[PDB]
Design a protein around this nucleic acid. Sequence first.
DNA 1: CCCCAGGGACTTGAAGTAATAAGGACGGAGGGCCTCTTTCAACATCGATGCACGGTGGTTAGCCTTGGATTGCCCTCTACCGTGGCCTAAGCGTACTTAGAAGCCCGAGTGACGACTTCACACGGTAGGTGGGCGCGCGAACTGG
DNA 2: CCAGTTCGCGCGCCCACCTACCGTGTGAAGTCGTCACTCGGGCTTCTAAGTACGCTTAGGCCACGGTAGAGGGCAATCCAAGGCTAACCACCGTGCATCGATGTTGAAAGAGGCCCTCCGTCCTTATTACTTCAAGTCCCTGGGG
Lengths: 78, 78, 95, 95, 93, 93, 107, 107
Amino acid sequence: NIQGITKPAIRRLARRGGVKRISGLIYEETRGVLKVFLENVIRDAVTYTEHAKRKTVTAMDVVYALKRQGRTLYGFGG
Amino acid sequence: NIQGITKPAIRRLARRGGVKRISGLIYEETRGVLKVFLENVIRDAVTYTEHAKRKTVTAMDVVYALKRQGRTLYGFGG
Amino acid sequence: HRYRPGTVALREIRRYQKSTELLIRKLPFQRLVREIAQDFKTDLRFQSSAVMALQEACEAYLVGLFEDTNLCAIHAKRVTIMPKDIQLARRIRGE
Amino acid sequence: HRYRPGTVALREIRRYQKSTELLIRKLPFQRLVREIAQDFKTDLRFQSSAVMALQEACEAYLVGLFEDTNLCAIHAKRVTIMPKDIQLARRIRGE
Amino acid sequence: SRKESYSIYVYKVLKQVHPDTGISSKAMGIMNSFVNDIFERIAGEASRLAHYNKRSTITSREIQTAVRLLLPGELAKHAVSEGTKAVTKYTSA
Amino acid sequence: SRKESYSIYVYKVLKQVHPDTGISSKAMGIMNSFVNDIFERIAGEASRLAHYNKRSTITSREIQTAVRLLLPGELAKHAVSEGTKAVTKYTSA
Amino acid sequence: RAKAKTRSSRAGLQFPVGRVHRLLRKGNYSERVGAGAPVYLAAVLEYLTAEILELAGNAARDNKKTRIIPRHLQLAIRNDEELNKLLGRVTIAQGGVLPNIQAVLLP
Amino acid sequence: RAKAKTRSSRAGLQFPVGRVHRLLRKGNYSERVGAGAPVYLAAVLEYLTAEILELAGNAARDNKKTRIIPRHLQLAIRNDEELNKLLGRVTIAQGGVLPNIQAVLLP
DNA sequence: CCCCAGGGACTTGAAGTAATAAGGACGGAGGGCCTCTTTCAACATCGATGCACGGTGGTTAGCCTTGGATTGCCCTCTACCGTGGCCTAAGCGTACTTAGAAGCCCGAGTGACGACTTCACACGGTAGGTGGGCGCGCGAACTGG
DNA sequence: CCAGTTCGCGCGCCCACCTACCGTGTGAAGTCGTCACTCGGGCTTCTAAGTACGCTTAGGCCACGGTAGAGGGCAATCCAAGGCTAACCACCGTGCATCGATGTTGAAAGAGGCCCTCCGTCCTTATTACTTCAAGTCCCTGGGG
């Protein structure tokens, strides 16, 4: 499923970042980087979920998880 | 007063940073960076002092200024 | 008519920097979330808005990284970002 | 006897990386502290330990910057740090 | 279940500065998060300031001091002015 | 004026792990800052958890989740074990 | 009795003074909250929202649009030196980025 | 009555449970504090202190020293990934840095 | 620079749907009262911050010779670009199934609280241990030949 | 390597002063006991989260020839470091004068807990106009000649 972040998708993200040319090895590095980031955020969001005695991760939980990692998110209710 | 940060002193700091060879333009650059850095910390530490209606900046005041800027300092009472 | 290598690249920057839609396919991202979440707790559900919140953060984070990575590449008098550039960006940020 | 350029420099790194004393002259540094603080409020006094705290943070902070600057410098296949390297390092740190 | 927000207040202020400009539901969500976000910093910072001085009451002084620490440059100057003007009028009802 | 600190407790812990090793007054100060720092983080994070879950009581659950959130990797695992063991013994007096 | 006059109206503010006061008491910030604290706090939030909103509405007019969407807010925050510094570490959902191309990549 | 037995001893801890409880109740963290919270919190804090000290004492021993100084603490903290991550943005006064020379600069 | 052209911006004309204006409700502000206490201000007390002076070297400021670092030219080649072909499934419609999110009700297990008490802790005090200045000879990495 | 040396540095020789152990009072931590009340548990219902399963473009995956950016080699030129000197002032140590950190105490300015009253703000609805997509036109920058 990690391959679902397709090569064209990674290219499009880089273009938004102002990247003009992309080396052929970048795609594998980005996938690895994304894996690390996602694990951290999801870990915290799931941790909050267990504390709330809930079985469904809510957007607010993610927002809280993002705040503690210094990646405050605006737009999902706080 | 900024000239008191002499060339050897700036060099020694760079040596601690693992720098092997240093360009002649670093000394002027470093002074500017330090001044900015110092202004922010002193600004906050002085601000704390004025709120307490005190006339002497204490060690605690400096540590707090550092904490809120993400530079927690250990060894001086917090 | 054939555009010279690089001409189309500048056009994509302008188009994607002008647009705001999410650029990673939704379903692939959703499948990714569920596989990762499985390792922490089984049969974990996610509000549709929860997945959206993750994607917004993830894209913004990656955009931020590619921007910093580019500066590193440009710094080395290159225009191509390479794995060594990403590593540097991450190292400086403290990751 | 004349050591070739670089031999003594590496010797200084090892010596200074093992030691912990403060490397900026104390009096000149204090005057700077007082001079900068003078612009915000007059007749401002400073506890002696307060000046030491500022000095420790500044030296520690500056050393940290030089380490990241070096990584940027190496990235450009150079061994000499230059102002553009500090600028790059600081930009990436978000300052 | 009724869930409090700043929506009504955000809309009033918008109509004062830009009478003909609206706001999308998404943008409203952003504004609520922003107001709460700044609110936490101000309220949270005032607490440490209050705590440092062994005081149990947070007064306008702490808010003023907290504001000076957080708002950068001219933002602080104008924000402090606005609060003081408002509070002054308030004490005279 | 008496100034509270964790010095005695820091010394006790040191004497268990290194009976023949001392610590300087400066190093002792470091530990005090450390203890307070970790305390604040846990206590501050614990407050958010309670507030997020609309519970006015801070209990074992909040600290347990707080530790799982703050402490990285195995530090949390072992710390959580220690806390659980201590509470269990305490509840049985 | 006399007609009830809201604390918000006495201070000439649009933000809810009473709610902020209750929120401070129930926000676990301090044991007590002075009568001047909520008024001052409310005015500051109002001013800042006005500032951000004012700059964002202007950006909207430049784009010939009459309704604010996340895009306009991102422009306002990143295009303003003072507000950008305050909101450095914030991610605006559906905001996109500022048009910025490194000079070395241009033809 | 019976001899006063500290809550720390009842839980087998060296850290002051009684003191931690007072700090929680008066630290503006929550309205109420559960009976296990100060105990639980104190136990975690004690364990973490032990961890650093254990690693620091080892570093001290390696230098033929009998007193831990800030230098030794820096070595212990930076050499442990987990402790380093937890205390990443912390500066130890009089700590110095880890001996580290970039490979490309070596002769 | 030109001709030919390939893409995006601009400008109506139809849909449509989210903004939003308008009405009913309740619980959350607001006025009002009596009440507990936090804190301004007064006055008091002494530590420690500022200032000064005389040395006393250690450490800087500046210069000279230098050879190794920088960098610009050059080739070169091979690692991505852009276009095309071609197939897969993501986006969405529509619908159904149902797990648990969320809520209402309840009590008893829980913590706030007060009164009282006592010994764990911190401040003053004492006396040795650890380690730094002084001083020296041993470990060996480096560099001109 | 040969050969010489500078640096690094470990090992003492004291002294000394930084810290471990000791003596004392107390205030806050411990215990009993009362009582208010929070949230874990039982039960219920509706949402939307998952699921299925079809369609239809639309975009991803592969191939392919090429081209320009990345990269290695070379040389000149140039500029920070090693070594030398004269000299500056950072710091030790002492000493004093005096501000304000710091503490205490009175009482009143302030904020609370509770209570009755009112209306501001939120849920709900219906209606737009501003947005949105499609097409058609026009500007304009781009690349081989």
